[PDB]
Amino acid sequence: EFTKDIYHVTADLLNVRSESNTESKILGRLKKDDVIESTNQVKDGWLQFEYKGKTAYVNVSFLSSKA
Ligand SMILES: [Mg+2]
């Protein structure tokens, strides 16, 4: 049983941020075709999710539509 929405990275690379902006720490980088799981709604172009156990955010223009 799964409940989480999936997004894949469409851009070649994507920074994972500690806040919903580019003035926060980069927690890591994802590459094209990697996926993230989330239950949250997109807010002002950013999506909150859990990355390596931490609250994290990505710019959704670098992501696919939800699956
Ligand atoms: Mg916080």
Coordinates of N, CA and C and ligand atoms in Angstrom, one line a residue:
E1 N 0.9 -1.2 0.0 CA 0.0 0.0 0.0 C 0.9 1.2 0.0
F2 N 0.6 2.1 -1.0 CA 1.3 3.3 -1.2 C 0.2 4.4 -1.2
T3 N 0.6 5.6 -0.8 CA -0.3 6.8 -0.8 C 0.4 8.0 -1.3
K4 N 1.7 8.0 -1.4 CA 2.4 9.2 -1.7 C 2.5 9.4 -3.2
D5 N 2.3 10.7 -3.6 CA 2.4 11.1 -5.0 C 3.9 11.0 -5.3
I6 N 4.2 10.8 -6.6 CA 5.5 10.7 -7.1 C 5.7 11.8 -8.2
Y7 N 6.9 12.4 -8.1 CA 7.3 13.3 -9.2 C 8.7 12.9 -9.6
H8 N 9.0 13.0 -10.9 CA 10.4 12.7 -11.3 C 11.0 14.0 -11.8
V9 N 12.4 14.0 -11.7 CA 13.1 15.2 -12.1 C 13.2 15.2 -13.6
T10 N 12.8 16.3 -14.2 CA 12.8 16.5 -15.7 C 14.0 17.2 -16.1
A11 N 14.5 18.2 -15.3 CA 15.7 18.9 -15.6 C 16.9 18.0 -15.4
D12 N 18.1 18.4 -16.0 CA 19.3 17.5 -15.9 C 19.7 17.4 -14.4
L13 N 19.5 18.4 -13.6 CA 19.9 18.5 -12.2 C 18.9 19.3 -11.5
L14 N 18.8 19.0 -10.2 CA 17.9 19.8 -9.3 C 18.5 19.9 -7.9
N15 N 18.7 21.1 -7.4 CA 19.1 21.4 -6.0 C 17.9 21.1 -5.1
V16 N 18.2 20.4 -4.0 CA 17.3 20.2 -2.9 C 17.6 21.2 -1.8
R17 N 16.7 22.0 -1.4 CA 16.9 23.2 -0.5 C 16.3 22.9 0.8
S18 N 16.9 23.6 1.9 CA 16.4 23.4 3.2 C 15.2 24.3 3.5
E19 N 14.9 25.3 2.6 CA 13.8 26.2 2.7 C 13.3 26.4 1.3
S20 N 12.1 27.0 1.1 CA 11.4 27.1 -0.2 C 12.0 28.3 -1.0
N21 N 13.3 28.3 -1.1 CA 14.0 29.4 -1.8 C 15.5 29.1 -2.1
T22 N 16.1 29.9 -2.9 CA 17.5 29.7 -3.3 C 18.5 30.5 -2.4
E23 N 18.0 31.0 -1.2 CA 18.9 31.6 -0.2 C 19.0 30.7 1.0
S24 N 18.8 29.4 0.8 CA 18.9 28.4 1.8 C 19.9 27.3 1.5
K25 N 20.3 26.5 2.4 CA 21.3 25.4 2.2 C 20.8 24.4 1.2
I26 N 21.8 24.0 0.3 CA 21.6 22.9 -0.6 C 21.9 21.6 0.1
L27 N 20.9 20.8 0.3 CA 21.0 19.5 1.1 C 21.6 18.4 0.2
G28 N 21.4 18.6 -1.1 CA 21.9 17.6 -2.1 C 21.4 18.0 -3.5
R29 N 21.8 17.2 -4.4 CA 21.4 17.4 -5.8 C 20.8 16.1 -6.3
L30 N 19.7 16.2 -7.0 CA 19.1 15.1 -7.8 C 19.4 15.3 -9.2
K31 N 19.3 14.2 -10.0 CA 19.5 14.2 -11.4 C 18.3 13.7 -12.1
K32 N 18.2 14.0 -13.4 CA 17.1 13.6 -14.3 C 16.7 12.2 -14.1
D33 N 15.4 12.0 -13.9 CA 14.8 10.7 -13.8 C 14.7 10.2 -12.3
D34 N 15.4 10.9 -11.4 CA 15.3 10.6 -10.0 C 13.8 10.9 -9.6
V35 N 13.4 10.3 -8.5 CA 12.0 10.6 -8.1 C 12.0 11.2 -6.6
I36 N 11.0 11.9 -6.3 CA 10.7 12.3 -5.0 C 9.2 11.9 -4.7
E37 N 8.9 11.6 -3.5 CA 7.6 11.3 -3.0 C 7.1 12.4 -2.1
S38 N 5.9 12.8 -2.2 CA 5.4 13.9 -1.3 C 3.9 13.7 -1.1
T39 N 3.4 14.2 0.0 CA 1.9 14.3 0.3 C 1.4 15.7 0.2
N40 N 2.4 16.7 0.0 CA 2.0 18.1 0.1 C 1.6 18.7 -1.2
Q41 N 1.0 19.9 -1.0 CA 0.6 20.7 -2.2 C 1.6 21.7 -2.5
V42 N 1.8 21.9 -3.8 CA 2.7 22.9 -4.3 C 2.3 24.3 -3.8
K43 N 3.2 25.1 -3.3 CA 2.9 26.4 -2.9 C 3.9 27.4 -3.5
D44 N 3.4 28.4 -4.3 CA 4.2 29.4 -4.9 C 5.5 28.8 -5.6
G45 N 5.2 27.7 -6.3 CA 6.2 27.1 -7.2 C 7.2 26.2 -6.5
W46 N 7.0 25.9 -5.2 CA 7.9 25.0 -4.5 C 7.1 23.9 -3.8
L47 N 7.7 22.7 -3.7 CA 7.1 21.5 -3.1 C 8.0 21.1 -1.9
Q48 N 7.3 20.9 -0.7 CA 7.9 20.4 0.5 C 7.8 18.9 0.4
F49 N 8.9 18.2 0.9 CA 9.0 16.8 0.9 C 10.0 16.4 2.0
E50 N 10.3 15.1 2.2 CA 11.3 14.7 3.1 C 12.4 14.1 2.4
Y51 N 13.6 14.7 2.6 CA 14.9 14.3 1.9 C 15.8 13.9 3.0
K52 N 16.2 12.6 3.0 CA 17.1 12.0 3.9 C 16.7 12.4 5.4
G53 N 15.4 12.3 5.6 CA 14.8 12.5 6.9 C 14.7 14.0 7.3
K54 N 15.0 14.9 6.4 CA 14.9 16.3 6.7 C 13.8 17.0 5.9
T55 N 13.1 18.0 6.5 CA 12.2 18.8 5.7 C 13.0 19.4 4.6
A56 N 12.5 19.3 3.3 CA 13.2 19.9 2.2 C 12.3 20.4 1.2
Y57 N 12.8 21.1 0.2 CA 12.0 21.8 -0.8 C 12.7 21.8 -2.1
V58 N 11.9 21.7 -3.2 CA 12.4 21.8 -4.6 C 11.5 22.7 -5.4
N59 N 12.1 23.4 -6.3 CA 11.5 24.2 -7.3 C 10.7 23.3 -8.3
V60 N 9.4 23.3 -8.3 CA 8.6 22.3 -9.1 C 8.7 22.5 -10.6
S61 N 9.3 23.6 -11.1 CA 9.4 23.7 -12.5 C 10.5 22.7 -13.1
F62 N 11.3 22.1 -12.2 CA 12.3 21.2 -12.5 C 11.8 19.7 -12.4
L63 N 10.5 19.6 -12.1 CA 9.8 18.3 -11.9 C 8.8 18.1 -13.0
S64 N 8.4 16.8 -13.1 CA 7.3 16.4 -13.9 C 6.0 16.7 -13.3
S65 N 4.9 16.4 -14.0 CA 3.6 16.4 -13.3 C 3.6 15.2 -12.3
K66 N 2.6 15.3 -11.4 CA 2.5 14.2 -10.4 C 2.0 12.9 -11.0
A67 N 2.5 11.8 -10.5 CA 2.0 10.5 -10.9 C 1.3 9.8 -9.7
Ligands
MG1 MG 10.9 24.5 8.8

